[PDB]
Structure formats: C-alpha cells, structure tokens
C-alpha cells in the first residue's frame, strides 16, 4: 500500500509537470509560429 501511494503521488507530479510543459510550449508554437509564418 505504501508503494502504490508513493508511485501514485509520482503520477500526479508527472501529470502536472507535463501539463505545464504542454501549455508553455503550445504557447510557444502559437506565438513564434505566428511571428515566423
């Protein structure tokens, strides 16, 4: 049970971090793809 709790907390951490990356970098696509093409 401790192992599943630990690994699950890591799952939320990865989910949040991946979301932040996706957001910032979709914004990067939007912005600089407009400034280029």
């Amino acid at each position: 049970e401790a192992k599943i709790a630990e690994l699950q907390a890591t799952i939320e951490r990865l989910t949040s971090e991946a979301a932040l990356a996706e957001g910032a970098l979709e914004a990067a696509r939007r912005d600089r793809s407009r400034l280029q093409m």
């Epitope: 799952i11 939320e12 989910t15």
Partner: nanobody, 97 residues
Framework: LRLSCASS????????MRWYRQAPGKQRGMVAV???????NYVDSVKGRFIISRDSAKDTVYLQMNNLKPEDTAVYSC?????????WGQGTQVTVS
C-alpha cells in the same frame, strides 16, 4: 457544451486518461487530465475554462465546455493510456463561438 467518451471496458481499471485538442492547421495538443484517483488538472490555456469528471459506473469520462471564446474552436479527440499503450478514438470537432 459537454462532451464524453466510453471505453471498451474496465473503467477505473483504466489508469491515466486525458483529452486532446486539434486546432486546424496545427499539430496535436493535450487538454485536460483525469486519473484513476480523480486527481485532475488542465492545461494553462483552458485552465479555469474546462471541467472534467469521471463516472465510475458507465465506463466513461466527461468534458464540459465552458464560457468558450471561439479561439478554442477545434477538433477534439479523447485519449487513454493502458499498460503502456496509446489509445485513440475517432474524436470530434467543435465550432466557432
């Protein structure tokens, strides 16, 4: 303003699943994330905007459109992850305004 999908089987026996947004003339993009926990988060663009909810009973997940500005107009496709695999459906589109 409310959209859903159904899995083959084993809802909540299905671990992480999320939804993706395909703006036209653009490449793939993640939207929002439900987990097996019900732990949830969104992407910054739709933060505050969209709301996602899981129904354990009828093998499904939910996305509800909110206060949409036409800019989100796109074709959406609901995704899931199962023992290390992709799982993509056919997806569906959303319109202006």
């Amino acid at each position: 303003l409310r959209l859903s999908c159904a899995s083959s089987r084993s809802i909540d026996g299905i671990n992480i699943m999320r939804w993706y947004r395909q703006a036209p003339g653009k490449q793939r993009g993640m939207v929002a994330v439900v987990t097996g926990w019900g732990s949830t988060n969104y992407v910054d663009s739709v933060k505050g905007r969209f709301i996602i909810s899981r129904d354990s009973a009828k093998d499904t997940v939910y996305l509800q459109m909110n206060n949409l500005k036409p800019e989100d107009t796109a074709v959406y496709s609901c995704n899931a992850i199962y023992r290390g695999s992709e799982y993509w459906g056919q997806g569906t589109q959303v319109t202006v305004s």
